[PDB]
Amino acid sequence: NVITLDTSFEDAKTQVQLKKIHSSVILLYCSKDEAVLILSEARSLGLTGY
Amino acid sequence: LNIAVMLGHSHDVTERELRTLWGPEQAAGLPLDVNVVALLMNRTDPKSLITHVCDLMSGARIHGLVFGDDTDQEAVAQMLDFISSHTFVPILGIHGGASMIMADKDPTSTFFQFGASIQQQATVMLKIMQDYDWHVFSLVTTIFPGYREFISFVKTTVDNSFVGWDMQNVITLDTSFEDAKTQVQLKKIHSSVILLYCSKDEAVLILSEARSLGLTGYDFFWIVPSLVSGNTELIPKEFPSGLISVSYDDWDYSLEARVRDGIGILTTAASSMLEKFSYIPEAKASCYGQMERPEVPMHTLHPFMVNVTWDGKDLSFTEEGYQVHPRLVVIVLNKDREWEKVGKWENHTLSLRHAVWPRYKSFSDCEPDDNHLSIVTLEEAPFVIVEDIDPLTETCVRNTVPCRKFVKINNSTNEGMNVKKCCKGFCIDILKKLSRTVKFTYDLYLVTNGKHGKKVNNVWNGMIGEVVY
Amino acid sequence: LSTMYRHMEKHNYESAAEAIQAVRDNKLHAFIWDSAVLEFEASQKCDLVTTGELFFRSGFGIGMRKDSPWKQNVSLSILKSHENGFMEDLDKTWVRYQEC
Amino acid sequence: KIVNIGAVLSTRKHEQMFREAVNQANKRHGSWKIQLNATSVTHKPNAIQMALSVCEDLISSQVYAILVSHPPTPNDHFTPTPVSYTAGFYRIPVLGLTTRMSIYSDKSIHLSFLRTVPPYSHQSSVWFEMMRVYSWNHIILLVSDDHEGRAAQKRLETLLEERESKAEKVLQFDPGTKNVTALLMEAKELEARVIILSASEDDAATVYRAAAMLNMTGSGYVWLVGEREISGNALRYAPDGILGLQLINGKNESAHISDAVGVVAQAVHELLEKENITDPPRGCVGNTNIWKTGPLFKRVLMSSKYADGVTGRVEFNEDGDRKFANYSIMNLQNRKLVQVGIYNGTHVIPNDRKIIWPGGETEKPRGYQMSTRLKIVTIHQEPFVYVKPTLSDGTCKEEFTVNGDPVKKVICTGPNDTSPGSPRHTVPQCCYGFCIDLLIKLARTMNFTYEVHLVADGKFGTQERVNNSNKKEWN
Amino acid sequence: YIFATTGYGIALQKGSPWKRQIDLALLQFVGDGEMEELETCWLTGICHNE
Numbered sequence A: 001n002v003i004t005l006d007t008s009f010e011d012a013k014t015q016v017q018l019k020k021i022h023s024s025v026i027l028l029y030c031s032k033d034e035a036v037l038i039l040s041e042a043r044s045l046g047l048t049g050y
Numbered sequence B: 001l002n003i004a005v006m007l008g009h010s011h012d013v014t015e016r017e018l019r020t021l022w023g024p025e026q027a028a029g030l031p032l033d034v035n036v037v038a039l040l041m042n043r044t045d046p047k048s049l050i051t052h053v054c055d056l057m058s059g060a061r062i063h064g065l066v067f068g069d070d071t072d073q074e075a076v077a078q079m080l081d082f083i084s085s086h087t088f089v090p091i092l093g094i095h096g097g098a099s100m101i102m103a104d105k106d107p108t109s110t111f112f113q114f115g116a117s118i119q120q121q122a123t124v125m126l127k128i129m130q131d132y133d134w135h136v137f138s139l140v141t142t143i144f145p146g147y148r149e150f151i152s153f154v155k156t157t158v159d160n161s162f163v164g165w166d167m168q169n170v171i172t173l174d175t176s177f178e179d180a181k182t183q184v185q186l187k188k189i190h191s192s193v194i195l196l197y198c199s200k201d202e203a204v205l206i207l208s209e210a211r212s213l214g215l216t217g218y219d220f221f222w223i224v225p226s227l228v229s230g231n232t233e234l235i236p237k238e239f240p241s242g243l244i245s246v247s248y249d250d251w252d253y254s255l256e257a258r259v260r261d262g263i264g265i266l267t268t269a270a271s272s273m274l275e276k277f278s279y280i281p282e283a284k285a286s287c288y289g290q291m292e293r294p295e296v297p298m299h300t301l302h303p304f305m306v307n308v309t310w311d312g313k314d315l316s317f318t319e320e321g322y323q324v325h326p327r328l329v330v331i332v333l334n335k336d337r338e339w340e341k342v343g344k345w346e347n348h349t350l351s352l353r354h355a356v357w358p359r360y361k362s363f364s365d366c367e368p369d370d371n372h373l374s375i376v377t378l379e380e381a382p383f384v385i386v387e388d389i390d391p392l393t394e395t396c397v398r399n400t401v402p403c404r405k406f407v408k409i410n411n412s413t414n415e416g417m418n419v420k421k422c423c424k425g426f427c428i429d430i431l432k433k434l435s436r437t438v439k440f441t442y443d444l445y446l447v448t449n450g451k452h453g454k455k456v457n458n459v460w461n462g463m464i465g466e467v468v469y
Numbered sequence C: 001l002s003t004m005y006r007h008m009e010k011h012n013y014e015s016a017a018e019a020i021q022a023v024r025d026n027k028l029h030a031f032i033w034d035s036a037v038l039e040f041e042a043s044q045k046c047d048l049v050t051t052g053e054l055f056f057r058s059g060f061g062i063g064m065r066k067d068s069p070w071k072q073n074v075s076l077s078i079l080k081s082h083e084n085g086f087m088e089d090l091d092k093t094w095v096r097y098q099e100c
Numbered sequence D: 001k002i003v004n005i006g007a008v009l010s011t012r013k014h015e016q017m018f019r020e021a022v023n024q025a026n027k028r029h030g031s032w033k034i035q036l037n038a039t040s041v042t043h044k045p046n047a048i049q050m051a052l053s054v055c056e057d058l059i060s061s062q063v064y065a066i067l068v069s070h071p072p073t074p075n076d077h078f079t080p081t082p083v084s085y086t087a088g089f090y091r092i093p094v095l096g097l098t099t100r101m102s103i104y105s106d107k108s109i110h111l112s113f114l115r116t117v118p119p120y121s122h123q124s125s126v127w128f129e130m131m132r133v134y135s136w137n138h139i140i141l142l143v144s145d146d147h148e149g150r151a152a153q154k155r156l157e158t159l160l161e162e163r164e165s166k167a168e169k170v171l172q173f174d175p176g177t178k179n180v181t182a183l184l185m186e187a188k189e190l191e192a193r194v195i196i197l198s199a200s201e202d203d204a205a206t207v208y209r210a211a212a213m214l215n216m217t218g219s220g221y222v223w224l225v226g227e228r229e230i231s232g233n234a235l236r237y238a239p240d241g242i243l244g245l246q247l248i249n250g251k252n253e254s255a256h257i258s259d260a261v262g263v264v265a266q267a268v269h270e271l272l273e274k275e276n277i278t279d280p281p282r283g284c285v286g287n288t289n290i291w292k293t294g295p296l297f298k299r300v301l302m303s304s305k306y307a308d309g310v311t312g313r314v315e316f317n318e319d320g321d322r323k324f325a326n327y328s329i330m331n332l333q334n335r336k337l338v339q340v341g342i343y344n345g346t347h348v349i350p351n352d353r354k355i356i357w358p359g360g361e362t363e364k365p366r367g368y369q370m371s372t373r374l375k376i377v378t379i380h381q382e383p384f385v386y387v388k389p390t391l392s393d394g395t396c397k398e399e400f401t402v403n404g405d406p407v408k409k410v411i412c413t414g415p416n417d418t419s420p421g422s423p424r425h426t427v428p429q430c431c432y433g434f435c436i437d438l439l440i441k442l443a444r445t446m447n448f449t450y451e452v453h454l455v456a457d458g459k460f461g462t463q464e465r466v467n468n469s470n471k472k473e474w475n
Numbered sequence E: 001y002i003f004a005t006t007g008y009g010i011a012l013q014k015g016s017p018w019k020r021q022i023d024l025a026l027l028q029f030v031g032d033g034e035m036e037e038l039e040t041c042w043l044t045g046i047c048h049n050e
Ligand SMILES: *[C@@H]1O[C@H](CO)[C@@H](O)[C@H](O)[C@H]1NC(C)=O
Pocket: C069, C070, C073
């Protein structure tokens, strides 16, 4: 299913949304400004593995 | 011959003194009657305690010391252990600051608290898991005094058991206040039942991280040790409900009961010592000074604490001072943030359960789920068979599903205990095959009204009636 | 097939020799053991016979402790003996005999 | 900003010299304002008087730490447990001088105890490093029934399990038992040829005396002896070939005290900028509460780094003890100690002096002697193992195959009767068949000495349920 | 009548930490019997006479 983010600058529901992601290939439809924060969240959650 | 007891200011003085006097007079008349020296002072300082020890030593050679407490400080236990080591006087641990035991008993010390080691708590948790049929483990720990040997013990216990627990590795947190590696460590957690070996201060932050990551769901379960749940009256708003814990708090045994048990154990030990050797013990020249060399010609009381029985209860102690049959009541955090007893452990070191499985929901957040759905089945066809669990600490060996059945007690009463039953057959295999495709939890029940039935008086019966209602 | 243990556990004997003696004495109607052993027993004594094609096919081996440094040096020797014709000669001299 | 630091010292000379040292240090380094007004106390032999004096002169004198030193008499114990216990009420940190015992290593017994002397866990790490750099595979451990010994054994097991290696045999000693011959011979009948001891001086001496009796000081043996097990009578009772350990600048009481006071003189400034400080009560009587800044003090003490120390940078582990301590390997040559192996930390610095070994060997013995004595167990299987009784001469009758070749036979050992509840006798049997041929082939190819044995129960052995069924043991 | 009744196995690497998992997985598959269907639908010896 599509896991759509609600709004920027949450810091609480973003981890909940990222929890539901249990795949190997992830498609991103995001903006340039929010790309930095979403990649920082992925790095914190360790979603940048091999 | 001479036993002293120390109490706090929680209750009155005269009633406690009268009860302590009446204690030994109830039964088991010793040849040498023991006196009572009870003091109630709110002050709890090491100098006051050592002065009291000196006074009771001057008080007709007091042989045994019982110390009560009202605070939760663990330094008083350490100083009592030091006093016992330097005085060779047996001291028992009662409710209060000395309730928690974390320091190993000195070889020259004679100390026997009423607490239980983490190893006993570990096997109590294992028995609870066996009762819940939770075969998946998630061991998350932190650098804490003596936790590595606890991990080694729990590993060498789970691998040595026939249950067949999960082979999940131990995910130990490195240091507090990281905010970066904590999420990485929590990522590796992909289990349903999680065991926590953590401290009270770090519990708040780890539960906040779990709430942020949404680990407090219906499927997920949390286990809290005794030290974290020591302050039952202190329930912070950030602690989600359902934190099952095991302790021995004053929910069924009061301070009077504990001091009765302590004085009974002391009297039994004194009687055994007198039967073995006819020699009244004597103290040193000072309270715990070193004017002369420290020597104890009489044999230590450690061997005398093995074959101890009071009022038919084997309330003895092991070589490490741990209780052979501790209370170990199980407390579950209620939805309205209360602690209730759901079982005991004194029944020949076995586990007792009230058989109340669904007690968890969205506490940290507000998001209802319907992941737990009840299933009702019959046993009238060669497709579902229920069998009694074998009394060999195993849950129907292998390839089974937990079940519930109302076993009628008497011909009039319709009360039925939720006894676990086996589940095998073609339908069980079909359900297990569907489980992988549906990744859904199961709650299996049985029909309590005969066979399937039909519409009687415009009311369905059996599984059909249960589904309709 | 979990119902087997309701009958297997109540008829376990003490040794293979005792089991085969009981089978010869018309005590047990059937016995379960390795195919090679049963085939050799049937070949040596014509009063017995082996039934069934095969099920749960497996193999033998040599067991050593995990810290023993004699793993590769034994495996290589076993393979050398197998490929040098020693195994077939041993089978002929210890298994292949008169057939009923 | 006036603070005080306590100190328990053996003699008044040490008290005055350390007072002068702290007075000088208060004006060294930064020297922003007035720093320390230290107070010193002596080790009173009477425990009660010592505790009362410590309470009166420290709790009521606005102190934050206690400098507990080594007892003046090494033979006597004088355990520093009481002062640490008293300081534990308010989470008061205490600085240990040379308390190497692992009793204080665990924080459960002593919540507030930060000693600059490395425990025996560091010695175990040094032994592990020596094993890594010398490539030892067969290693056994001898640990007495003491808390420090158990801690050292646990540390060694944790540090060794990461390299898929486990000790072949671990034995337990007692403080006073002299009949260690059974344990010594049990260790002897093993492939490992390295023996390591960790106990008191008397226990080490009485366990090393039997080594000469059982010829354990000969060639092909390596001895790993701890720092405290070489001192005392061990020097006289131990011949050459002992590889001891020693701490460089470890017994330097003045240097250790100077380093500790230099650390605290900056730690106090690093902690005083907080919002509030929990001052101690004005007397030994009146207050029963606990400081809320104890964890803050512990964190600021453990996280601080000081390169001004004699040993170099000062850092604390999770237990708040010395990290990467300087170790010196002592070699007993001609009944004399020679410093050869000096290790700063995580680095090997060999010296030109040769490392001797017991038995006069000039080369390092590998310690890998399997002795080719592989015990063999055989199960009675009719098509493969033909068991027949032996004659009065001890040898079974000799037959021939269909081709006339001589059939090999092996002397068999096992119970006389397989029936349970019978007087089992280990009479010599005679088992032969298919397995013995390949066993003899292995023996003649790779030099194996086979000794076949039978099984009393006649079972292969799987998991079984017995009394105390939580113990899953193979039968 | 095979002269050398050998097999195929899995070619691992010297020192690779897979000998503690691959062998266990193979033994579990053999015990539970997941090769009968594979050998029936992949070998299927047509020439059978009785
Ligand atoms: C195995 O054989 C080789 C020579 O083929 C030999 O060098 C080696 O030592 C043997 N292994 C052992 C454990 O002896």
